[PDB]
Amino acid sequence: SALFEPYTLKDVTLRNRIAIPPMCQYMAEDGMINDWHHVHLAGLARGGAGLLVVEATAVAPEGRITPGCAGIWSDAHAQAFVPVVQAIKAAGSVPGIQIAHAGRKASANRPWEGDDHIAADDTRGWETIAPSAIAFGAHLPKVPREMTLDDIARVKQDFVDAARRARDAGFEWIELHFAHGYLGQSFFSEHSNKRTDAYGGSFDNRSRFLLETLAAVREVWPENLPLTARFGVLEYDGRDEQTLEESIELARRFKAGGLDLLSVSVGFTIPDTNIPWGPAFMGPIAERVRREAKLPVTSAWGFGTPQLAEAALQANQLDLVSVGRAHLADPHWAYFAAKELGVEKASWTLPAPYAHWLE
Amino acid sequence: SALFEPYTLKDVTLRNRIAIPPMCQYMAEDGMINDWHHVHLAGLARGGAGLLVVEATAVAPEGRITPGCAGIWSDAHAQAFVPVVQAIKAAGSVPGIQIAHAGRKASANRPWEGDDHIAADDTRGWETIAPSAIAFGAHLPKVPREMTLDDIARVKQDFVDAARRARDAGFEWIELHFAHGYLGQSFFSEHSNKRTDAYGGSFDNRSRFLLETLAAVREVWPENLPLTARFGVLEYDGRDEQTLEESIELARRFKAGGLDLLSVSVGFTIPDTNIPWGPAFMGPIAERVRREAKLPVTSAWGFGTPQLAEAALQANQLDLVSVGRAHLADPHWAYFAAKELGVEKASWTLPAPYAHWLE
Numbered sequence: 117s118a119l120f121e122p123y124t125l126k127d128v129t130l131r132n133r134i135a136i137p138p139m140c141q142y143m144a145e146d147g148m149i150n151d152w153h154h155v156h157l158a159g160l161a162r163g164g165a166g167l168l169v170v171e172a173t174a175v176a177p178e179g180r181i182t183p184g185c186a187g188i189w190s191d192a193h194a195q196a197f198v199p200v201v202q203a204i205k206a207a208g209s210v211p212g213i214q215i216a217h218a219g220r221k222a223s224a225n226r227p228w229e230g231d232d233h234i235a236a237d238d239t240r241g242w243e244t245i246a247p248s249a250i251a252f253g254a255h256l257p258k259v260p261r262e263m264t265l266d267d268i269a270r271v272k273q274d275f276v277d278a279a280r281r282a283r284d285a286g287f288e289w290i291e292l293h294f295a296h297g298y299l300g301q302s303f304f305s306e307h308s309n310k311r312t313d314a315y316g317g318s319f320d321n322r323s324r325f326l327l328e329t330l331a332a333v334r335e336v337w338p339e340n341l342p343l344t345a346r347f348g349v350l351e352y353d354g355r356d357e358q359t360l361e362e363s364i365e366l367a368r369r370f371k372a373g374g375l376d377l378l379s380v381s382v383g384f385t386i387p388d389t390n391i392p393w394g395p396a397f398m399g400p401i402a403e404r405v406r407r408e409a410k411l412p413v414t415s416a417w418g419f420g421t422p423q424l425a426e427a428a429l430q431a432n433q434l435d436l437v438s439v440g441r442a443h444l445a446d447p448h449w450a451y452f453a454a455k456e457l458g459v460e461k462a463s464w465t466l467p468a469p470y471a472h473w474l475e
Numbered sequence: 476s477a478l479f480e481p482y483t484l485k486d487v488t489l490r491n492r493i494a495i496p497p498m499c500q501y502m503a504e505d506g507m508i509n510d511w512h513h514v515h516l517a518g519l520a521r522g523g524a525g526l527l528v529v530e531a532t533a534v535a536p537e538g539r540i541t542p543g544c545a546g547i548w549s550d551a552h553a554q555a556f557v558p559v560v561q562a563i564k565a566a567g568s569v570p571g572i573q574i575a576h577a578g579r580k581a582s583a584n585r586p587w588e589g590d591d592h593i594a595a596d597d598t599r600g601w602e603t604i605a606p607s608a609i610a611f612g613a614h615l616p617k618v619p620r621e622m623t624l625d626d627i628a629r630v631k632q633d634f635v636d637a638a639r640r641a642r643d644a645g646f647e648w649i650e651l652h653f654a655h656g657y658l659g660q661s662f663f664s665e666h667s668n669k670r671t672d673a674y675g676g677s678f679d680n681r682s683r684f685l686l687e688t689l690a691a692v693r694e695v696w697p698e699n700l701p702l703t704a705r706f707g708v709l710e711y712d713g714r715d716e717q718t719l720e721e722s723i724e725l726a727r728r729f730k731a732g733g734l735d736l737l738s739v740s741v742g743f744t745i746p747d748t749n750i751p752w753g754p755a756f757m758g759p760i761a762e763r764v765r766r767e768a769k770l771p772v773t774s775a776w777g778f779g780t781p782q783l784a785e786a787a788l789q790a791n792q793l794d795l796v797s798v799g800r801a802h803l804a805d806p807h808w809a810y811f812a813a814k815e816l817g818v819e820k821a822s823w824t825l826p827a828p829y830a831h832w833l834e
């Protein structure tokens with residue numbers, strides 16, 4: 117089966133094509149991860165996936181989505197990941213991390229605690245920053261502060277510091293979070309970026325924050341470890357052909373700038389959209405990006421049906437299949453997939469103390 | 476559903492009737508548990524089961540089954556359990572432990588490393604002890620040394636020390652391992668106990684080691700925490716009616732001696748048996764013990780089909796249903812069961828960072 121073929125990118129080899137995408141847990145305290153994360157991540161790694169990407173981890177305190185978000189904005193924050201990385205490696209999975217800045221979507225409640233911007237007088241909240249002083253709307257009505265050029269330089273450096281820390285903590289795979297309406301996505305989108313300086317207006321200017329951040333990170337991230345990004349390539353906002361064309365052009369620039377793989381997503385930049393949800397719905401758009409930018413891709417949404425994951429790989433729509441919620445339901449989803457797809461000795465997807473008894 | 480009704484025994488309340496029975500991992504080193512066990516057990520606890528019983532944990536080095544067995548024969552061994560117990564409690568499951576001595580079945584290879592007695596000249600092995608100098612046979616040919624009265628006193632005290640350590644490490648549930656052909660079972664069975672002193676011959680004498688050990692443990696184990704045992708009540712050796720009658724009589728004595736619940740098993744004392752394996756096959760024998768000894772029971776073997784677990788509870792065959800291998804396959808089996816049995820808000824069997832997204 118295609119799903120269980122290994123994959124090599126730079127010096128890193130994944131044992132199969134199952135990636136666990138970043139999934140926020142909302143369990144950190146002042147950015148510091150804890151035994152919630154340790155057990156969650158080590159357990160996932162033991163389930164058999166080839167790659168485990170740690171949740172959106174904030175490069176700066178104000179770049180958390182919520183008060184429960186993980187952070188890597190100090191060396192002490194980074195140190196907290198060391199034992200988890202080591203446990204992921206012990207289980208034979210590749211440890212990755214998504215480094216992030218939530219931009220105008222920051223300072224929000226946890227999803228089971230209202231999912232909305234935190235009230236102004238709640239002592240947990242903070243001022244958000246963005247390309248322009250324009251609110252997302254809906255459940256995220258807070259108007260962000262327009263970034264200064266010095267803010268832009270500082271956030272870029274925060275991404276570099278985060279990547280350097282990720283490297284030194286032992287991560288073997290990094291993903292820059294340029295998707296889902298957060299800071300990077302919001303610099304790219306005309307909906308959110310009304311700047312008239314070097315960082316807004318034209319395609320080149322809207323691309324600039326993303327490209328400069330990638331280039332700056334590339335200076336500290338080892339060339340032998342995959343350098344990746346997540347990027348929303350359309351919005352389902354009635355401007356999809358134009359948006360896709362620009363996004364694919366930016367993907368070509370990312371590739372030329374050393375990006376090894378793109379995780380293809382939806383932008384979620386604004387709320388007034390009409391996303392055609394369905395199992396594997398992203399496959400055709402991922403395939404178009406893959407083909408037109410000639411860049412390896414992953415995508416997600418509904419690939420927990422193992423036959424869908426297999427079909428996407430066989431059709432060359434994807435290079436890796438990201439499977440999120442199914443792993444929250446069953447940490448050992450990769451074993452279920454192995455059985456479904458008829459992998460010989462399927463139980464040996466798991467470590468010996470499980471595999472021996474399930475065979 | 477019956478499976479998701481809470482259960483109170485002494486001062487302890489289980490959130491549902493799902494018990495995870497002891498399952499050896501064979502991952503300890505010189506008896507010391509490690510991050511294998513931490514993540515395994517914490518992950519299981521988060522999956523939703525009401526009770527998690529830690530694997531057979533040796534009361535003495537020679538009472539390990541294998542070189543990978545957990546031990547609790549020193550305070551330093553016990554300390555290693557403290558963070559795991561605390562993680563189990565944090566997840567809302569009740570932490571239990573099975574304390575054990577493998578008797579003539581000790582000094583064996585791990586199951587995926589031959590499953591047989593360790594060769595005499597292998598530096599990992601050790602002399603086994605038992606009631607009588609008689610081998611199990613088959614893959615366990617080693618003849619054990621016949622215990623002296625001082626050996627008997629010492630092993631009893633090792634069980635007391637183990638129980639005291641379990642208590643002080645924060646366990647809320649203890650299970651004495653008097654099943655599966657190990658030391659305790661082998662004192663009860665005429666197949667393995669040919670002693671002609673106070674510890675063999677008559678029913679009273681064959682019962683004596685088990686009853687004295689229970690009584691000694693009872694002196695240090697808090698009266699407000701469940702005191703339980705696992706015991707093989709028949710062998711499927713052509714002597715089942717006689718063996719069951721004696722085993723039920725011993726169960727009555729255990730109850731009179733403060734036993735709160737019996738985990739009903741098969742003896743596995745000798746290899747030449749004909750066990751009628753099948754899904755839930757133990758239900759009727761568990762029910763007979765429950766009824767005739769008027770004692771709460773659990774049992775196992777094939778209850779990973781949630782409807783079977785439900786039916787056994789509704790028929791009053793069992794008070795708790797133990798589900799073993801299905802939890803190795805899927806740590807979140809209790810969530811699967813909740814869905815199968817139509818529990819409202821089934822995903823909230825799991826903690827918020829999972830439940831919110833699966834609802």
Ligand SMILES: Cc1cc2nc3c(=O)[nH]c(=O)nc-3n(C[C@H](O)[C@H](O)[C@H](O)COP(=O)(O)O)c2cc1C
Nearest residue numbers: 137138139140171172416417418419439440441832
């Ligand atoms: C609990 C949860 C948290 C998520 N957190 C992130 C995250 O940190 N970064 C990100 O880019 N996407 C995040 N996502 C999106 C997932 O990575 C994924 O794309 C999505 O869940 C769809 O895949 P699935 O159908 O397999 O779950 C999250 C999704 C879930 C359910």
Ligand SMILES: Cc1cc2nc3c(=O)[nH]c(=O)nc-3n(C[C@H](O)[C@H](O)[C@H](O)COP(=O)(O)O)c2cc1C
Nearest residue numbers: 473496497498499530531775776777778798799800
């Ligand atoms: C990996 C493994 C290890 C076990 N170790 C123990 C143990 O430590 N003590 C014990 O009394 N039974 C042990 N057992 C038996 C289980 O507790 C249980 O009775 C059995 O697996 C049947 O239940 P199941 O069909 O749900 O797996 C073990 C079983 C397995 C599969």
Ligand SMILES: O=c1ccc2ccccc2o1
Nearest residue numbers: 139140172181227295296
């Ligand atoms: O980038 C993100 C971060 C969190 C999150 C939670 C649910 C769904 C999607 C998400 O995307």
Ligand SMILES: O=c1ccc2ccccc2o1
Nearest residue numbers: 162206207208467510511
């Ligand atoms: O897959 C594995 C195999 C062995 C192991 C040992 C310790 C911790 C984690 C492990 O994961």
Ligand SMILES: O=c1ccc2ccccc2o1
Nearest residue numbers: 498499531540586654655
């Ligand atoms: O008491 C025990 C201990 C280990 C074990 C392993 C497999 C099956 C049954 C077992 O019982």
Ligand SMILES: O=c1ccc2ccccc2o1
Nearest residue numbers: 151152521565566567826
């Ligand atoms: O079920 C839970 C809920 C919360 C929690 C926090 C830290 C560690 C484990 C936990 O388990």
